[model samples]
Structures are given as C-alpha cells and as structure tokens.
Target: DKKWLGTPIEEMRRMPRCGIRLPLLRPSANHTVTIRVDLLRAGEVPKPFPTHYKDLWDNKHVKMPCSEQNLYPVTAGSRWELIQTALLNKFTRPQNLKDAILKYNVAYSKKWDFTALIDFWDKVLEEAEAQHLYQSILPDMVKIALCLPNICTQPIPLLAAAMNHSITMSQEQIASLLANAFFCTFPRRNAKMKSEYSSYPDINFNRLFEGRSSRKPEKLKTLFCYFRRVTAAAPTGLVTFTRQSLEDFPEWERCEKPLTRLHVTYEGTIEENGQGMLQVDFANRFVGGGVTSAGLVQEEIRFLINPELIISRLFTEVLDHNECLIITGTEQYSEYTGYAETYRWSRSHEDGSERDDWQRRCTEIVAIDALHFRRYLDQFVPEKMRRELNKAYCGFLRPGVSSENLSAVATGNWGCGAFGGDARLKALIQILAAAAAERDVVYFTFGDSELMRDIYSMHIFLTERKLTVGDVYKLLLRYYNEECRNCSTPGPDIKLYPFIYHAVESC
Candidate 1:
C-alpha cells in the first residue's frame, strides 16, 4: 500500500489556516530577530539569486573538475559499476560515439555534424566535472543505458496501470528513473519525424547540451542540485502519474452543472496558490516545451523547477487533444528567474508541502494542451471547441467520488501565450469544465489585470443567470460564427460575455 502525506482532505479543510508562514531571520550581533512576518507562505521566499555558475563565467570556456569518488549508491550491487564503465567509455573512448550513432541508427541530414556533436559531448563532460557529478553518477548512467531498450515496454505499462488505480511511486524510484533521463540514455526517443513516436513529447537531453550559452551553466546547476539531493538521501515520499482518455468522461455538452466557486487573480502564480489542489500545465504534447529546444514559457518554467516531470516523457505517448495527464507528489528542486531566453537558475528550494498516507506530497498537477490556433477563427470551429471541452473535462472529471470531495483546480492562460489561444475562450472552457465536475476554480492570470477583471465580470454574469453548461456551449457556437463573419469589422463590443448574455437571454 502507498503511504500518504499529511492529513486527509476532510481534516485539511477543517484546519483554521489555509497556508503556513515560514519565518524570516534578521541578523543581530549575537542573536537573530524575526521581523515582518507574512500571512501567506506561498511566493514569500524569492528564488535564489544569481546562482553558483555566475562566478564561473568566462568568455573563452569554463572547465569543471571531475570528482574522484563515485556518487551513485550501491544498493543494487555491481550493476552500478558495470553501468559506470559503460558511461566512462562514452567519454574516455571517443569511438563509442560513432558506434552509438550507428548502433542506434541515428539519422542526420547530409553529412554528419561530427564536430558540433562531439563538442556537445565535451560540454556535458565539462558540466559534469564542474558539478562534481562524474564519479557518483557514472554507474547510474550505465544502469540507465542498460534499461533503455526495455524502458518503453516495461515501466510504461506498470506506471499506467498503477496510475489507473491511483497508485503512487516512492521518491527513490522517481529519482532513479530521472537519473536515466539526465544522461539522455533512453532508446528510440530522439526521432523528430512526425510519423515516429509523433504523439509523444521529446525526452532526450541532447538538445539541451547541443548549444552554447551562459545559461547552460545555471541549467546544469539546477539539474545537478536535483541529482545531488535525490542521491544524497532518497526521499521517502511517493508520486503518481495518471493519463485519462476522453472515453473516460461524459460528453462535454451533457455536463450541465456550474462550478461551486470561482476565484480570479493577477498576483501569484498557479503553483504557489494551488498548493493542495490540482495545478494545471499548459503543456506541449511532448511535455517540456522548448526546454530541450529554444522555447520557454509555462511548460519550460514548470519543468525546470520540477525537473522530475521530465520522466513522464519516457512513456507518455503524444497527447490526444481530448486527453490529459495528472501527476501527483513530484517535489520541487530549485527556484529560477527570467522567462524564455532570459531565464536563469536562481537557487535551490525546499518544498514544504505535507505528505500523505502513501508518503506522497499533497500536490497534484494536470497537463492539458489547448489547441494552437494559428488563425484566431481556427479555435472557433465546433469540432475544435468540442476537442478542447472534452480535453478539459477529461482532466477535471473525478472517478468514484462526490464533487464536494474533489479539490479545486488551479489554472491560467493555458495556451494563450505561445500557442496563440484566446485567454477569454480558454478561461471559459476551464470554468465550464470545473462546473461540470462540480469543483471550484482558482484561476491565475499570471499578472494580467485585464483578464482578471473580465473573468470576474463574466463569472458573475453567468452565475446570476444560472446558466447551464449547454447554454455556454451554444453561445460559443454562435459567438464563433459571428466573430468570423465580423473579422473585417472592429468594435469594442466584440467581447465574449456580451455574446454569453445574449445567448442566455434568448434561452
């Protein structure tokens, strides 16, 4: 049986306070003083500043030293040593790269870019040395590689089965699996062709190491810190990943209930406020968007801080628009700064969330991708709307339980930024889903005041009318058609709620 963390849902709700306050220490000559205590513990602590890599920066090249002793544990016996030898050979014997490329049947356009590729390997070695990760993790790399061939077939089924039943995994298992991804050793995972594993997110770390940048060092620090912490003393907590398909949910239009409560905010982030609730990731199908590539946004920032989510890439197939993945109990490892190209590793973080009976943290995150509409009208298609509704419903629907028992959902600007989704449309879709599931919603606008105001006004308008979800569904259809026909026209009245109000009145 999986051990849970902290109190039961009933007990947690009964507790007088919703959030905990972490004390801040002020320095004195002989004693320390506590001053300026904050009510909310969330987001009070700023992410660690600058990071260790800032001092190591140089224009030429930064060379890091390799550790003399092995860092990986020997609980599994000589397997560690064998794995270590295999990893050492990758760097110590350069020919291994050639063999690996051919062995894995890695495809390249025109002539192979051997110099660039080898340089990437060199960078990996340099970073590993600088982080003192070489000795301890070498064997871990071998074990990871050895397990690569069977990874797709083995753990995926086990994980899926467990998740289907809400089973969770120990933190040690998560750390071990993630270590494999850190080395980019998973097999049959690097193809970019749309036809090959096209449904899954990219899991390879090679992309992260291929390019040169001042940012790479800090990224390494964030990653290395995770490895160090996980290996130092394996965490006792457990985590679970559950992927739900559309077939599991009722038809979207049939879901008629409105959410019990709604909250709109422009201040804090989703992860901060959604502590005990199910948090949302405006995810790319392959999960971590552009973290491996050059992209950065919601998904990238999420994956950077909670690096363990990368493990989901190993087995998760490319997402269907109507599907969603729910993860529980993964720990946050580091704090960061910046967004996209400007992002940096700021400092380590200590996640203070309580644990459950399964020894998992009382945290759940749901990843649902909103449709990427290149043209604004594309999102209005009835089929597209249905797809998104089904997708959100799949994420929001709870099994074998009462609605009152379900935790509120924390979400925001799901696909608005990089995916070009309309914030108003996305917010409405979520609200509809939460209402259908009979749950409350705490929406984060990520500092968008206009959106917050619009959503609050819209929610009140809908609530006062006691509109069913079907009412909104019909409204969306009419709104889309009208907006498309009026594409050439510009007016302040082309907002969503006006259409909603009209539709409700007509009903």
Candidate 2:
C-alpha cells in the first residue's frame, strides 16, 4: 500500500506551476484581449483574451513553451503577433482557418491535404451554421490557442518513461494545447525516426487533415465537435495525466488474497458501463494509435469519444510493460460506434458526471498495454505471461493512497482481437490480478455469449474452492506447461478453463 508517486495533493496548491489559479485557469470576465489588427471583425476578436505569467520559453525540450523562439512568428516576432496576423484580423471563414494553419507549416502546403477537413466542414455542416462556427467558435479557439503562454505560464514536463510525473491541467488549458495541435503549430513535435520528440507520438492534427479512407471523415467530425463544444462554453474542470511506474512486482506464488467480486456481461462496452471506475484502455504503445488517422478499436474509439485523450501523444513516451498511463477528468465530447471501418458519429455526448472537490470529473481511466504475441501459444511462455501479469497488475493499482479508496476495474477480452489473446486466458488474467490488487472487477464481454457464460461459470468454480490468488496462478502456469509448452498447434485451445476446473475439483 505505497502512497501515490508524485507531488502530494495538499502541497500542489502552493506550487506555482501546479496550483489552480483564476483568470488563466478560466477565461476572465472583466479582461478583454486587446491586440493590433488590420481588419478586426465585430465580436470576432476573442474577448478577455486569456492571460497568464512566466517566461518558461527558454528553448527547453521538456515542455514546449508557447513563447519559445521555436513557435511560429510574424514579422513582429511573437506567437501573439502570429495569431493576430493569421486569425483575429482575418475572419476568412473555414478556408481561412486552413490558410492560417498552413501559413506556419508552409512545408506541408503541398503534402498535407485538408480535403477531409474541408469535406467535414462543407458537407457535414450547413452553410449558415458553418458561417456562425467560423464567426464565433473559430475565433474563440484561436484566442485560446494564442493564450497558451498566459494560461500555462509554466513549462510542461514531457511524461517520459521511468518517471513518476504528472500534469494536472484545467480543461481550458488542455483545450488550448489542443487548439495548437489542431493548427499544427507545436515546434519539434513532428519528426521521424530520431528527432528530439521522436520517442513521443505525433501531436499535430496534420495527419488527420491529410490521408484518405472511409472512417477518416468521421474522425474529423468527432474532433471538430470537441472544439465546437469546449470553446462555446469551456468547462472549468481539471484533468490529470500521469506516467506511473512500479519497481516492485508481486510474487504470485505467495499472494493470499482471494478473487474479488465479479460482474460479467455480454452486452455493453467499457466506456458506457464502466463510468467512474478504472476503465481499461486496451491500448497501443503509440498512445492514440492512429486515432487521428484511422485505426479505431477499443483504444482508438475511447480516444475519439474523449478527444482530449489525443493530447497524451504530445509528451507521453512509448509505454513499457512496467508502467501505465492514468488519465482522470477528461470529458467525452462525442458519441460514436462501429469500431474501425464501420465507425460513424452518433451524436454529441453531454457528460453529466459529477465532479469531485477538485473540480475534476470522476471518470478515471488506465492505459496498460498487454503483450502483443505474434502467436497465441507465445503468450503461454513464462516470460510473456509474466509481462502480461505485471502490466495488468500495474493498471489495477491506483496512485495517491494505499488504503483510502480503490475503484473496481472495468475490463474485458484484452489483447483478444488482432493481438490473438485467448478470451478465457484474458479473463483469468484479469481475475487473478484484480484479486491480487484487492479490487473487484466489472467485466464486459463485448457480445460473446459463450465467453460471457463461461467466464461466470469459471468465477463460481473459484469462489467455492476457497482459492487464493497464488493457487490459481500456479494452476495457470501448470496449464501452460502441460498444454502449451511443447505444443505448437495454431487456433484457440479450450483447455484453459477445463484444466482449472478439474485441477481445482481434484482437491
């Protein structure tokens, strides 16, 4: 029961970089953003232009300071000047917004195509509605983007691997950061192979603007909708992004906790049913895993619904097995269904979840990537199994307190799709790890009746046996040794459940 691994919550209120403040935290009502403009439209100049302190822009790679020399500059040489030059004085509708973006990224003028963006704007939105969005929403978004320096006023540390660091940002702050991402303005964030931010995922929205596919267009609509909602009336909630690591692992042989409570369902998905719990993201190491482009599955779908999750790509490194990414308080803006190729926007999601004392939503999520084995049997190997077990265990543990409160985990069929993870094996893995962490599990089967039915039966078998976490751990290893050690056949094996069944009954 080790305490949380970062700055204590009580002390965070005193840290200038971490504490919550007014005016910058939320747009000030009395302050108006005054700037020089050639042709300022009536009400087009974003009011109370957001403000903040600090000159954190000292050419550091840790947090990309908004006012750094690396940022786009007009002849006047400032991010604010560039904003005035590109957007405020220029109310050039949707097409103009694209130009404002391409102005900074001139190199992408030929390569990046905004056909998808334009398609969403022109085809999805009515002409007059588009005009209003450009007239009102676009300006607000641009102002928020320009106000990054004032709002942040502090350097954001890159959430690199092996570090227990977190950034608890306001919803406005993240939206501001996302506005920059939308305009493709972050310097040094886009590179190939071995650039400064190479270890991080691509943050710019250029890729989403480019490319062609069936689902590409809907992705554009979903993200644009986020800006539309957030800018219209920004939320004052706080969201936290943390990179957590575990140096010590549980020795499964000696663990005594029995399997905790279990709820198995074949009907729903994780996000809908698992609200406020530790919802599991069956993730890819690349964070959003091309959600900005087209790869939509459990992870991608989750990111698209809560488009803010895409910001993790900005600074989070490729997650390793020993660590997990935990995000709290991110709002889900859009509703979508039909994973991947079938994905389509259903409607806007009105997130009514209650906020905590810190003005943060209780929607806690954990990202733990399981071992993506090439062959199904490869997971049966001891090292691979150990990796999966450790990864799941890390996700189940909450940071900040050892014994205060632990949320039940919401998970199902992790690594089971293209990753080829066996369903029953994944069920057992979740069960064993939840018990080890002293948490209950609310499992969703994603519409596999047999899987849902069988998992419950498996649950009952363990519950009556008075088994500890270690007992099932040994049975799993033994099953692997006898069933998969030398065996090399492909396809699913039905032995995992039955092996445990008779093995436990034998006693």
Candidate 3:
C-alpha cells in the first residue's frame, strides 16, 4: 500500500477499489420509493467530493502537494495609503472629535485659569467655525488655554461646552480647531506682536490702540484686525509640508513646469509563478518608465547577485558626465561648482598626511561660496527672483554669517526632491560641503554599510604610503564589484571616477 511512488492510478487505488462494502438493511414493514422520497424535502446543496475510508487509509502515506499563493509586498506608498485612510476616518467620524473635545474639557476643568481660559475658548470657537482649519490645531489651542493663565478667566468645562454649542464644524472646522490648539501650546516669540485681539488677550491691548483719540473704539478695532490676520494666515490644505511653502512663490513658476522625457529601456521578470513582481512595483512608485506589472514574465531564474558597496571610479565618471543632464538653466550647478573651485586650494593635501589647516581652508570656502552665490544671482536672475532667492538663502546663511563661519549651512541637513533628479542632489551636496569647508572638520555619514567598511579597510591598507587619488579609485571599484555586489546594478553609461574625483576635490 505504501509503494505509490511514480505508479499508475490503478496501482495506487487498487487497495480501495478492491475493498468490500456492507450489505443494505430493509425495514420489516412494506414501504414504497414515493413514500420514502415524500418523507424528505429536497433542498439545494453544494456537491461534496465522494471519498472512501479505505482509499483515505491507503493514500495517507502519500504526501499531498500544496498549492501556490502569492502575497503582495508592503510598500511605502501603500503604507501612506493606510495612514491617510486612518487619518481620513478620524476626520469623517464626528464622535471622534467630540470625544477628544470632551476629554480636553475634562482636563481643562481640573486645572482652571480665568483670563487665559476665556481667550482660549474664543479662539477655539473662532477656528471651529472657520471654513479652512486643521484638526490638530483645536486640541493644541485647548492645551495652550490650560497652560497660560493670562488669556482666560472661566471654568474649563463651562468654556468648552459654550464653544462646542456655538460651533457646528465640518472637516475644515476640525482642522481649524486643531491649529488654534497648536498655536496656544507653542506661542511664538513674534506672535505677541499680533496677539492684541479680544479672542487672544495674552497680547498687549494698550499698544494696539496707542494712537487712537478714542481708546475704547481703537482697542476694539485693533482686536478685530488681529483676528483677521490670524484667520487669514491659518493653513487650509491637508498636505502641509513642514518645509518651505512653494505656493505663491515666484520660483515655483519656473521650477514646477512639466518636462517631456523618454525612458530607454524597461523590463522585469517574476521569480516564481503566481508571485507578483516586486521590483516592478517598486519602480512604479519612484521611477516613471514604460514598464508595468504585466510586462514581467514569470520565469525560473537564479537569485540576483549582491549589490556593490562602492561605485567604481569609472562608473561614477559615467554617472557624472553621461547619465546626468541639466534640465533647466545652467545656473543650477553654477553655485555648487563655483563654491568647489573657489575652495580647491584649502582641500589640497597638506604635508602628505595632516590636513591640520582644514579649519582655515573651510572658512575661506564658505566666505567665497556665499559671495559668489550672492553676486551671481544679483547679476543674472531677475530682481524679483534674486530678491526671493536671497530671502530664502539669507535666512539659511544668517547663522554662518553671524558666527563668521560657514558650518551652519554645511551640516544642517535639509532639502527636498522638488529640485529634480541627480543635478539637485549634487547641488545640495556642494552647498553642504561649502558649509563644512568653513568648519575645522567635515564629517560624512555613509548610508551604505559595506562602503563604510571598505573605506575603513582602504584607509588601513594605504596608511603607510601616500594614497594617490588613483589608489582610492581602484579601492572603490574593488569594493563595489567584490564586496558590495548585492545592490550594485551597473548600467553601460554609469560611471564613478568623476564623482570620486569631485568628492575628493571637495574634501
């Protein structure tokens, strides 16, 4: 019975087919087939597979094959979807906000303040009734009311109830409430200048109407003006990025325009049947190309080799010279290269090993880079654009200028993908380097673990001899090909030598 490997069906089922069955039993009383059928009413039922106990016993020793099932991989975009949905549900559900407000009311009741409490409720109600507002702002406002005593003078529960009754909010109302709450929690230093409104009494009321012949009317007018500004400045959109707002920004007009592009090659293959294409899915999220999930044909293939940690010097060269293209005005890269070229002397090798004078070198680079940036923009860009760019860059340069050092702009890691592809990424790197060049030591944290390990190895490998730039290039390529082989997908046009040279030059 156990001898069923690669055997015919007849041989496999022989034991069950040859088995004996029990004889039928009949009642002593006479019964007709019609009477038996009438005893049971027919109903629709799903068909069941016929099975014999003998066969089950015989086949018990044979292993059954399991069917294949594919599970979709979780992606960042998918996670974002889930987070957005949960947030949306919180917005759509009326009780969620009401419960939150009720909880806030309870907390406010336990801790009471008169003047601060009243101003808090008034702002809360104002924002709740406003058409455009954030949900986070409401609770934040309540907390501010609870924290600061100067703005309110009423029982917390009473204040909360009164505001809730007065305002019937939509999603927008919830948002405004949240914003008002936030403003109350972290009251800005300069916000005091605009705080003289009756709704936000923490602001000085006397200065608001100092010039008025009739003080009472002037105070009221000032309060109304303050509220107007608060309402106008409140954020309305759901997608509020903490970074600089591009809306109404003149640079946005030039930066946001769409461009035509074509992808040279696109292809994908599935590792297993019934398993969806993971690489294709990833590409769809970040890379715009002609390929799709349907294009991936399921095929039996070996696992992919590991990516290389360090990109080869030659490949980096290709990446710099061939793969990269400047889409917009040449001015984009001008600031970066200008900063680099100006500081080349400081970055040169000093007495074989010690870059002891790096601090002085960095200072020179920062001053020069900033000067050139300002001068170039002032001359080339329109007055309006130049003004805006300076406004953006000046705030960035202030700390450095005040300190007589460029370190502030160098290590302060911040930027966005809005600037476009490799060009923008490189520009950002230069600006950061320019800032570091002003500092005593520039530190770069590598994201690729293997590359870091190889760098350490290379440093030790050439510690005794003078490490020529060529030696560094070879080390990088070896690390990329042999050590960090898992993720390195080298393309024909990709190059690394130019980038290495540039990176070393900047260093």
Candidate 4:
C-alpha cells in the first residue's frame, strides 16, 4: 500500500469557528536569490531515448564523461553512464533544420503557451511594419527569424521580469499567525451560541446536544437497530452477458436488439478543484446494436467480442445493488445509504443511452490505490494465457505443437485463401502471447474491475484478520481456477510438461 507521509489529523466535528481568517499574498522571501533556470535543448539531431536502460537498476549512472561538446553536470542525481548511453543511442542524427522543425512542432503542441509565441512574432512584425522596410525584405526576414531559433533568442531577455525593491512583510509567517489566530477564536463563537440557547429551559435541552435523546442508551439502541438491518443484507453477484452466453442463458436474449454499431471517439479533461487537470481526450469505440441472435452468435467468438462494455454493465449492476459494502464496510448503515445515494444521483443524471462516462469514472475511483488490481491483471495475461494454450495443445501425453513450426510457414505459402489462413491466426496469437510475456505490457493496459474487487476483498481479509501463507496460496489458486472456468478453456485440467519444456527452451 502507498503510505501517506504525515501523522493523521483528527477531523473537527463542530461547525466552523469565527476566528479563522484568509491570508493575502505578500513579497518574495528573498529580495535577490540567485535564480538559475536550465533549458533542456533538443539537439540538432532527433535521437531515440535509450530503451534498454530504462530502469534505474539496470545502469545506476549515465556513462557520458564531462566534455566541452556534450556538457555534463556534476550532480549525483544525474547518473553519467545512463546519460551517455541515452545521448549516444542514435540511429541517425537529425540535421539542424529538421531539429528546428521538430522543436517548433513540440512547442506548438502545448496549447496554453502557443499564444505567447504568436504574440512575440506579432510584435516583431508590427515593428517592421512601422518602418518603410515592412513590405520589402521585412517579410522574408520575419520568416527566416521564425524558422531559426538563433535569430529569435535575443528578444527573450527583454521579457524577463524586473525585480521590485523592498517588500513590507514575510507572507508565510503572516499567513501562519493569522491561521492560528482564526482557529483559536472559531470554537468560542459556537460555544457562545450554545450558551445563549441554554438560557431558556425548553431550548436548553434542544440546544445542548442538538436534540439528542434524553435516554442515551435508547438512542444508541435505535441507531444499532438500523445498523443491524443493513448489515443483515448481502449483495447478489451480477454477471455480464456475452453474445455466446446470451444464447446459453435465455433470459439475456432480449438484450440483443437490432442496433447500429458506430465507432465514436471522445476527448475530455479531468480536473481537480475546478482546474489543473490533464485534458486527455482518449478515443475508444463500442460495438452496439445487433439482433440478439447476432450478438449470441458473435459471443461464441470470444476474441471478436467487446469485453469493455460487457464488463462495464456487470460492474454497474453490482455497484447499484451493494455500493454500501464498498464504502461503509457493513457498518454505518445510514452512511452506506448516503454513499449509494450520491452514486445514484450522478448515474441518474448521465445520458440514458450511454453510461460509458459514468462507468469510466466509477472504474477510475476503484482504480485509486489499485495495487493488487494491477498486480493480478499483470499475472493473468501471460501466466494465465500460456497456461491455457499449453494445456490445450501440449498437455499430458498429448502431441505438443511447437509454435516455432508455425512461425516458419509464410502467410503466402499457407494452405488456404490469402487472408483466411491459419497462418494469420497463428501469427496474431504468437504476437499477443509474446507481448503478454513482457512484464510491463499487461500492467500498463488492463484494468479488470471485477478482478480488482476480488483481490481487494481478499486483501482486507488477509490483512485485517489472521491468515496463513498457505491460506493466501489457496486463495490465489482459487482465483486461477475460477478464471480458467470463466474462459471455458482446457484450463488447469490438462497437463503441459512437454509444452512447458519446449516453450522455455525456445524462449
């Protein structure tokens, strides 16, 4: 688990006090602190970043020696070995002109700062227009200056801020003092309100504890009763329907309606405190609206089916029924209800035709502190997929099919139509299998919320209660078994000793 760094502060239960005050900004702490700004230059050559030594563990330091041409800073954080390798790992060095174009493009991508460049060029053009030279060589000069950074670099110093003299106060000290003073007096205001209310007999009891029951135990019992009612409840596990599964399960067949499938791309920004959020307009599409019959047929072909929408709908249904379990831990009955209340409020406000946005936000929240979520999914892709393929094709006494044999045959020479050959399928499977084997691939992409939930539930059980190592192993084994069953593959039932031997040897 990621650790929060400071001591946990006890939350204040009472209303805000009157003494609290906001601070106004003052002058900088230092009148003339040495401010050194370093600009990272994209050199005249466009070079690829070193991919092999991406991890700090691989090469602790960059190998580049300090030299006149490639200036290296004598800093501990900037490892020499890695830096040298990175700088030198160029397939082809970009020419000066090409580098300038690439740099301009990079700068243009940041929308927030593009206007500044436009303003700078506009001013230069305006100055040229004022003189008779405006229409003459002025346009050509402007174009040349724009293309070459050297010509424009001199104007940058003109934009530097002029430091002002003598400020009256230290902002940090003043703000701290004011905050303390405000908090100190804030509680007294509430106390005075209580005191005023206590003056009258009828009002005194009501005001003292905000109409808390005269019999404390009775009130406690009443709260406990409500808690018991909610705690007694349990959630029903909701399953997503697949086209193949729809045919198997008659009840879900109704969902397969004639609808057009459109691939729509959307982009949006996520914000915090109303600002400073990355505007990530990611594009993904959904296949929607087909006859239930068609969907049922499509479901049989697992690879072709859309997993995202199915998984989304299932989790939504699960959240709708047992959202209380997520936040309240079967206690705080009223609060659990409140949690569900907010979820329902937001979900209800969403477009009825598309709950994609709603599901995405919900997934995002569940993904917060999703350590186990990531770990398990990473384990699943290669470890799980390999286990299945091995068992099915090369298990216990079964003829082990060597993947190397498949790779040898070219697609053109395959024993079938140009495209509808096994070679293509084999190639795809091999590519996916190889990619899944890579450590970072699955961890970066997959976000299975159901798997995340199961892992979280097991985590709570193991950490909060006493659990043996064997018990933990058993839990993992159970997950593996269940996942295999879900996929309806040969799974753990088949033996793959020969396949395993060949696979490792080939790798």
How high is the CA lDDT of each candidate model? 0.60, 0.72, 0.21, 0.20
Better of 3 and 4 by lDDT: 3
Better of 1 and 4 by TM-score: 1
Q: How accurate is candidate 4 locally (lDDT)?
A: 0.20
> In model 2, what is the error at residue 81, expressed in angstroms?
4.1
> Which portions of model 2 miss their true places by more than 4 Å?
1-52, 57-65, 71-84, 89-95, 399-404, 492-494
Q: What is the lDDT of residue 427 in candidate 2?
A: 84
In angstroms, the error of model 1 at 134 is 4.3
In Å, residue 410's CA in model 1 sits off its true spot by 0.4
lDDT comparing candidate 3 with the true structure: 0.21
Backbone clashes in candidate 3 total 52
What TM-score does candidate 4 reach? 0.17
Candidate 1 lDDT, tens digit per residue, 64-166? 1111121223352333343344454533433454344333223542223334344434554566463344445444444534433222111223222112322
Which residue runs does candidate 4 get wrong by more than 4 Å?
1-378, 381-465, 482-507
Instruction: Name the regions of candidate 1 deviating beyond 4 angstroms.
Output: 1-84, 89-167, 191-198, 213-215, 248-255, 485-493, 501-507
Deviation in Å, model 3, residue 127 alpha carbon: 32
Rank order by TM-score, top first? 2, 1, 3, 4
RMSD of 4: 31.1
Q: Give the per-residue lDDT of model 2 (tens digit) for 121-233.
A: 67767888677767876788888887777666545667777877666666776888888888777866654544666777778888786655767778877877888888888
TM-score of 3: 0.20
TM-score of 1: 0.72
